[PDB]
Amino acid sequence: MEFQAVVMAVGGGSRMTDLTSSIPKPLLPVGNKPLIWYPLNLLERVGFEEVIVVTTRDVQKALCAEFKMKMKPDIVCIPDDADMGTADSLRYIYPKLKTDVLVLSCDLITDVALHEVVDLFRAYDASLAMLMRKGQVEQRDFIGVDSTGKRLLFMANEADLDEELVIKGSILQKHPRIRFHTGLVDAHLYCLKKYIVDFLMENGSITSIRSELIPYLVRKQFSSASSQQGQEKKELKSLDIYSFIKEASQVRCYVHIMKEGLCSRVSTLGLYMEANRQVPKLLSALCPEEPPVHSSAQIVSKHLVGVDSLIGPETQIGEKSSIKRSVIGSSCLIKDRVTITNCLLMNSVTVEEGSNIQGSVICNNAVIEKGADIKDCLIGSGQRIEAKAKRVNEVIVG
Amino acid sequence: SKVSLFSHLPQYSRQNSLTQFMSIPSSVIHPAMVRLGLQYSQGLVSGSNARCIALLRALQQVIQDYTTPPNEELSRDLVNKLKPYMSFLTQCRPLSASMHNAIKFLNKEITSVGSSKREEEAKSELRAAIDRYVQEKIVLAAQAISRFAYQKISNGDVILVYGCSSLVSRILQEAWTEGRRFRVVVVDSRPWLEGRHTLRSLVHAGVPASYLLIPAASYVLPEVSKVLLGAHALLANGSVMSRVGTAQLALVARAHNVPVLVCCETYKFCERVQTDAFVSNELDDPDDLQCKRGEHVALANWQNHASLRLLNLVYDVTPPELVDLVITELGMIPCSSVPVVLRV
Amino acid sequence: PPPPLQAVLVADSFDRRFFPISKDQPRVLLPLANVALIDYTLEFLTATGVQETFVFCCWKAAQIKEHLLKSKWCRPTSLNVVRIITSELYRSLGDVLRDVDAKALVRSDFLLVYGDVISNINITRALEEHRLRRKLEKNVSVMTMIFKESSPSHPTRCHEDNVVVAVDSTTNRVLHFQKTQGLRRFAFPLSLFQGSSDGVEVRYDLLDCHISICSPQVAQLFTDNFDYQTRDDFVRGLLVNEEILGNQIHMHVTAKEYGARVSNLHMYSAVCADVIRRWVYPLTPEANFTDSTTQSCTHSRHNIYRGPEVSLGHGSILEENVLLGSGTVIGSNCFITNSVIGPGCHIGDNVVLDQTYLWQGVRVAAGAQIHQSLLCDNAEVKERVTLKPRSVLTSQVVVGPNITLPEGSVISLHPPDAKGYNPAEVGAAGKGYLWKAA
Amino acid sequence: GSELSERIESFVETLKRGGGPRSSEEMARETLGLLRQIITDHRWSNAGELMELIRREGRRMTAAQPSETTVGNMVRRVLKIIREEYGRLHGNEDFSFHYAQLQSNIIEAINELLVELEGTMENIAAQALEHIHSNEVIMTIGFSRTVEAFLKEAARKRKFHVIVAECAPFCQGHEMAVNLSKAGIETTVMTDAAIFAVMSRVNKVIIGTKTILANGALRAVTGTHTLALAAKHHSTPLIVCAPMFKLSPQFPNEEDSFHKFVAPEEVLPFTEGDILEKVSVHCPVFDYVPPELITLFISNIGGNAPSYIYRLMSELYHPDDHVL
């Protein structure tokens, strides 16, 4: 009755080329579990009892009611034949929205408690409170915070900037000193109130919230009857937000950042292996009753194992199958004298004897051959494998 | 690590946040009041005036969203439901006498409600009663008090004030606007330093003013002509409870032959009795006492030393023998006549 | 230990912002709070341990010489040695720097100061930091600017001196330095942010004091470039040219001391007001740090200072913040507040003085009202005169009776360009000219 | 000659520009050493030249810093010693007759005075066992070394509790709190404003002082006066611990030079520049206390009433040298 959670997962990105389409984006394999199970479980950890998620018909078919978690998901079938954006989708679900909203994206994984950001939203009646993680070229963005490092004051991107940045000579007379940050990574945790969606109902120019909503909001939160009116339109700007907010300098923005911990969104193929490598550490405390190897897996080589060696169900193993912190899915056949280091595997992978795989990835219906000296790849689906070859920079096309 | 003298009184810190131990979608406690309790530990404290207004607003909002139980009436259900709420609010920070009187009045109003009316009618009646209470008991009383006190200010006077209080600032601004000329002296004390609010307000108004600290109070009393003070509560025997340091000012002013005036409303009259400026007080965070010396900050890691305690009181009590006049919405009376008149 | 600390003093303004008055008297000899404007700088230098000082003066250097020869700093018991060098070829700071480099005076880190600076700042910590920085590295830092923390709304921040500065957070190093005069927007190059990682700090809440700690290397940089003439040009050239050059410039900010420089009337009024109210504690009117037998005071309540042999009439009222010289005579039923009066002045009856400054030898007739004015040496005012705010009267001028000057009036003894006297301008029996405008 | 002038100038300049980490004992020792040095050199004919020179130097050093009083006390004591020696050597007061043993007698007398001065704090501390008893509460304000020694001497046998006021804005009570905590004594620190609230549970008040006047009045730190009044409201005894060189033959006639004022930076910071143009701030340092609020005086001789003080004055300074 106070917060409505909206989970967004429609469409992938340029870095994904064979995952978001062939496999459902929410159900991509990390830690032998679907990725969307990670944020959703967090929503069930705090105590949320209403989750609204929009997705396509294919994901709905792949989902139905297959999970046995207490939340009752409310799936709305978005039109698949669209180039939809955040603003348009939140425009769609507007009649079902009554209270403040909490937008989240499935690609995000973090371990930080949300009590801090919600406390910041509650205490200072802020319009919004986003999240940024310390950076770990694409027109680097610069954000300027005040001395206390809690209130956003400036934000810009290098895309429209040519060689310099300009600051109006009125901000400094109210905030004498500001601090700039360049290396940061955004997180989709926009905790905005009910008035913002009502304001954007009558304005159709905005299509993506990340690159269109926050810049205008932070630009307008500072100026007043002077500058934005003295130096520079209710009937032209479609009933501007200042005229909207009439309740008991009304728009204020705040941002929290943290320096230690893990918080990242898997939208690049590079971060995939860091994710699937570090997720067992989270799973050790998250689910302390999950063995590293599935119970119903046909294990033979129980002494050549490194760290955890995640293994799916019904997975036949061969003797002398050396493994070093590798990932293995379900229904995988493994023969003898096979060595695997820091590699990923998932459902229905067959392996011949005498193989050697180093830092690679394997897709569905892949048959490994004897004497295969593999050094980094991703491996296509429904294709057999030959000896040697494979590279990290020269990844196999198939 | 409390003082053995103040062992009974509880000591709390400002960094033991209680919000970590319940769900973000709060269901045990109404979210608006959770926000209010969170804000209680940051600010929104001014002479139990803003706090009472905020509490009444939150109570009105809570009453707005209510459902009548099928096998119960409003009178018992609401009363039984409200107890954990202000119990948790008390857990956040100790209350004040004005809030106790307000909640007593609200409970009395709730009990008297009959079952003939509908739920909506009862809700509207309760909202109207609360609005009437806040309108009658605060604003008009302040206007009447200002009108009464306008007659005790003359040209060429020097008035002394202490701390921050809305009533005194309102009185002084109204008197200056009415066309009278005088000047003011402000006295401040560590560690809150709340006199700067009054100093800024007076400077913006256009009144000459001077500023200084409490220990030099005996230096400037030969020039002063009147002393004007606010209050937080009024005890049965006629004593006045205020921020720590008021009794010192009263004593030194009495020693220098200067009259003392106290301003208060009639809804802060308490039924407690106290005979000394001790015993029933409230402690605060001791870490605020650390002086920002810049270099070699003393008292750092004060818990390391074996025997070392820091004391931080909030209140004190002034006996009625040091007060010459009390101004309320009913008029001006001597201090010792307070209980006989107001008790009714 | 390093050789004794040395200082360089510039006693020439090279400016025209004080030139309805500086025809007669040089700037450094102007009286502030009945004390010359050069004693404050010398006392400030002495109090910090400086053991040797050089003085350069060109314009009307004879008066400066004769004044310095009678001061207490030229006595044999003084711990600071004063040396006087005079010439008629100096035109800017660059010429002075070239001359001192040619004569090879400095041997180590030294100080460089103008002629009108009021402060009570100790230097030892900044000196130690500079020495450590130049010891760990080699000839990297060649300057250490000094600033004071202040808000952007104080009355001691003239529009002609406001600056905006961009610094590195970890080590105090100036990356950008811009002056803001008539600009409504501030711009910074993008190369700063990408060079660093977690700080490009931008500050607008600093007050400049024109105090520097310079190594000898600076002198060389003032000889190779023959176009440099001020400190701003040097700073901008060093910051722009980043091939090798001088490597870096550093900054130091104080928070619990005082420091300012006088350059116009607004600064003069602000500094005088701050000095009267004991904002520079060790240097106060009653302290008598000049040990002159003709200047003494007795502090009283409400910040009132009285000298020796001062007569007061009946009914006179002094409000607060008043300085009276020696031999001053006051009439009856007056009203003086926030004023400074020099030695040897006569005042009639029924006079109102507010935020006004009068120097020695000024006589004022009865029945007058003055507000926010400056009167120079040996002036006179007749009866029935009312001066509106922002009025200036130079030396020897007279104003006739039954007149009322408008706001901003300026009157000097010299002709408007340097004829009779207009009875409408200077009143009846008035001797002077109306300069008009600033 | 040159060395003497350099030392005099250094002393005067140190006096004028505030000072340093110097206690009263060090100041007295330096003044006595300088006076002995000026006596030794700067050859004089008879007593008159010596008296005139000493008086001139004393007037100069006194006008250097009015709020410092030990220098004048030492000067007057030396003058009285010179008078006594001249009276002894000699058989219509005239100081022109010439002798040869005068300087040696003066020098040995000054040496005896220094020896007496060195052994002072121990004598005061030796009486701590007759006033402090077990299970008692003692109040104090500020930071004084004499009180610290007085408490530490008696702490070796009995146990008690001490409450210290912070004495804003310099806040030097923290140092004494830490020092007493290190010695193993219960302590409590609180702000100034709570003096009257806790006075009802105090058994004794012990303080120090900066100067003692002829009639028994006190010149102490800012917060002392109110502290004296509240105690009188409960008839709680008040005790002052001070040596004998803090006594001056002055009276409280004019208070223009009594208090000492400093920069208003300590009270209101400079970062409030919007409103600093219309507000006046005053920061006094010292404070006057009448003699009716003092119970007992403890020194290196014993306990005395405030009335006895006058007598001591009459046997310490000649009436002629009251005004230099």
PDB file of N, CA and C in Angstrom, chain B residues 11 16 67-69 72 75 98 113 132 137 152 156 161-162 187 200 203-204 206 222 226 242 259 277 279 312 327 335:
ATOM      1  N   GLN B  11      20.244   6.185  28.720  1.00  0.00           N
ATOM      2  CA  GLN B  11      21.108   6.913  27.804  1.00  0.00           C
ATOM      3  C   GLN B  11      21.067   6.259  26.430  1.00  0.00           C
ATOM      4  N   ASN B  16      22.326   4.259  16.741  1.00  0.00           N
ATOM      5  CA  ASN B  16      21.695   2.952  16.909  1.00  0.00           C
ATOM      6  C   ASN B  16      20.341   3.002  16.198  1.00  0.00           C
ATOM      7  N   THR B  67     -10.667   0.620   8.953  1.00  0.00           N
ATOM      8  CA  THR B  67     -11.717  -0.320   8.584  1.00  0.00           C
ATOM      9  C   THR B  67     -12.395  -0.822   9.849  1.00  0.00           C
ATOM     10  N   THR B  68     -13.719  -0.744   9.881  1.00  0.00           N
ATOM     11  CA  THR B  68     -14.466  -1.212  11.041  1.00  0.00           C
ATOM     12  C   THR B  68     -14.458  -2.736  11.082  1.00  0.00           C
ATOM     13  N   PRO B  69     -14.056  -3.349  12.192  1.00  0.00           N
ATOM     14  CA  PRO B  69     -14.101  -4.811  12.292  1.00  0.00           C
ATOM     15  C   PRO B  69     -15.533  -5.310  12.274  1.00  0.00           C
ATOM     16  N   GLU B  72     -16.784  -5.813  15.974  1.00  0.00           N
ATOM     17  CA  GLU B  72     -16.268  -4.851  16.936  1.00  0.00           C
ATOM     18  C   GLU B  72     -16.624  -3.444  16.482  1.00  0.00           C
ATOM     19  N   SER B  75     -14.639   2.259  19.029  1.00  0.00           N
ATOM     20  CA  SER B  75     -14.171   2.812  20.297  1.00  0.00           C
ATOM     21  C   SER B  75     -13.086   1.948  20.926  1.00  0.00           C
ATOM     22  N   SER B  98       3.035  18.163  26.479  1.00  0.00           N
ATOM     23  CA  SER B  98       2.026  18.590  25.515  1.00  0.00           C
ATOM     24  C   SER B  98       1.493  17.406  24.717  1.00  0.00           C
ATOM     25  N   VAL B 113     -17.458   8.637  21.462  1.00  0.00           N
ATOM     26  CA  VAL B 113     -18.155   8.459  20.194  1.00  0.00           C
ATOM     27  C   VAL B 113     -19.175   7.334  20.321  1.00  0.00           C
ATOM     28  N   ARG B 132     -10.461  21.740  15.085  1.00  0.00           N
ATOM     29  CA  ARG B 132     -10.895  22.729  16.063  1.00  0.00           C
ATOM     30  C   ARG B 132      -9.907  22.826  17.215  1.00  0.00           C
ATOM     31  N   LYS B 137      -6.308  25.985  20.319  1.00  0.00           N
ATOM     32  CA  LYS B 137      -5.382  25.858  21.434  1.00  0.00           C
ATOM     33  C   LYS B 137      -3.993  26.420  21.159  1.00  0.00           C
ATOM     34  N   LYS B 152       3.850  45.781  27.938  1.00  0.00           N
ATOM     35  CA  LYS B 152       4.959  45.793  28.880  1.00  0.00           C
ATOM     36  C   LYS B 152       6.283  46.178  28.237  1.00  0.00           C
ATOM     37  N   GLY B 156      13.267  52.691  24.464  1.00  0.00           N
ATOM     38  CA  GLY B 156      14.541  52.752  25.150  1.00  0.00           C
ATOM     39  C   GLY B 156      14.853  51.579  26.049  1.00  0.00           C
ATOM     40  N   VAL B 161      17.092  37.718  26.026  1.00  0.00           N
ATOM     41  CA  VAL B 161      16.443  36.473  25.643  1.00  0.00           C
ATOM     42  C   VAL B 161      17.462  35.343  25.701  1.00  0.00           C
ATOM     43  N   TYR B 162      16.952  34.119  25.819  1.00  0.00           N
ATOM     44  CA  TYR B 162      17.795  32.936  25.940  1.00  0.00           C
ATOM     45  C   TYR B 162      17.225  31.808  25.097  1.00  0.00           C
ATOM     46  N   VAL B 187      21.925  35.341  24.422  1.00  0.00           N
ATOM     47  CA  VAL B 187      22.872  34.543  25.188  1.00  0.00           C
ATOM     48  C   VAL B 187      22.776  33.103  24.707  1.00  0.00           C
ATOM     49  N   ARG B 200      19.618  35.368  13.726  1.00  0.00           N
ATOM     50  CA  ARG B 200      19.366  35.569  12.303  1.00  0.00           C
ATOM     51  C   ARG B 200      17.982  36.156  12.063  1.00  0.00           C
ATOM     52  N   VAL B 203      18.026  39.838  13.061  1.00  0.00           N
ATOM     53  CA  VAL B 203      18.787  40.649  12.115  1.00  0.00           C
ATOM     54  C   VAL B 203      17.984  40.872  10.842  1.00  0.00           C
ATOM     55  N   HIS B 204      17.331  39.822  10.340  1.00  0.00           N
ATOM     56  CA  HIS B 204      16.519  39.975   9.137  1.00  0.00           C
ATOM     57  C   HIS B 204      15.339  40.906   9.383  1.00  0.00           C
ATOM     58  N   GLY B 206      15.266  43.548  11.353  1.00  0.00           N
ATOM     59  CA  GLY B 206      15.733  44.920  11.362  1.00  0.00           C
ATOM     60  C   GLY B 206      15.826  45.513  12.752  1.00  0.00           C
ATOM     61  N   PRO B 222      24.226  44.744  34.329  1.00  0.00           N
ATOM     62  CA  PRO B 222      23.989  46.145  34.713  1.00  0.00           C
ATOM     63  C   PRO B 222      23.265  46.973  33.663  1.00  0.00           C
ATOM     64  N   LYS B 226      14.908  44.169  31.479  1.00  0.00           N
ATOM     65  CA  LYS B 226      13.905  43.123  31.601  1.00  0.00           C
ATOM     66  C   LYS B 226      14.498  41.801  31.141  1.00  0.00           C
ATOM     67  N   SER B 242      12.430  24.104  32.164  1.00  0.00           N
ATOM     68  CA  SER B 242      12.956  24.652  30.917  1.00  0.00           C
ATOM     69  C   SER B 242      14.294  23.994  30.603  1.00  0.00           C
ATOM     70  N   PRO B 259      13.578  42.394  36.922  1.00  0.00           N
ATOM     71  CA  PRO B 259      12.362  41.574  36.862  1.00  0.00           C
ATOM     72  C   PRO B 259      12.451  40.499  35.789  1.00  0.00           C
ATOM     73  N   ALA B 277      15.978  20.569  41.040  1.00  0.00           N
ATOM     74  CA  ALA B 277      16.341  20.515  39.623  1.00  0.00           C
ATOM     75  C   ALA B 277      17.234  19.298  39.379  1.00  0.00           C
ATOM     76  N   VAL B 279      16.767  14.505  39.231  1.00  0.00           N
ATOM     77  CA  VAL B 279      15.943  13.305  39.383  1.00  0.00           C
ATOM     78  C   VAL B 279      15.238  12.949  38.076  1.00  0.00           C
ATOM     79  N   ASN B 312      25.307  14.889  30.358  1.00  0.00           N
ATOM     80  CA  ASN B 312      24.637  15.777  29.409  1.00  0.00           C
ATOM     81  C   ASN B 312      23.154  15.820  29.771  1.00  0.00           C
ATOM     82  N   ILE B 327       2.371  35.338  31.939  1.00  0.00           N
ATOM     83  CA  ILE B 327       1.405  35.802  30.949  1.00  0.00           C
ATOM     84  C   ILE B 327       0.856  34.588  30.218  1.00  0.00           C
ATOM     85  N   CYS B 335       3.203  34.237  39.922  1.00  0.00           N
ATOM     86  CA  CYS B 335       3.571  32.833  39.764  1.00  0.00           C
ATOM     87  C   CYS B 335       2.828  31.942  40.754  1.00  0.00           C
TER      88      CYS B 335
END
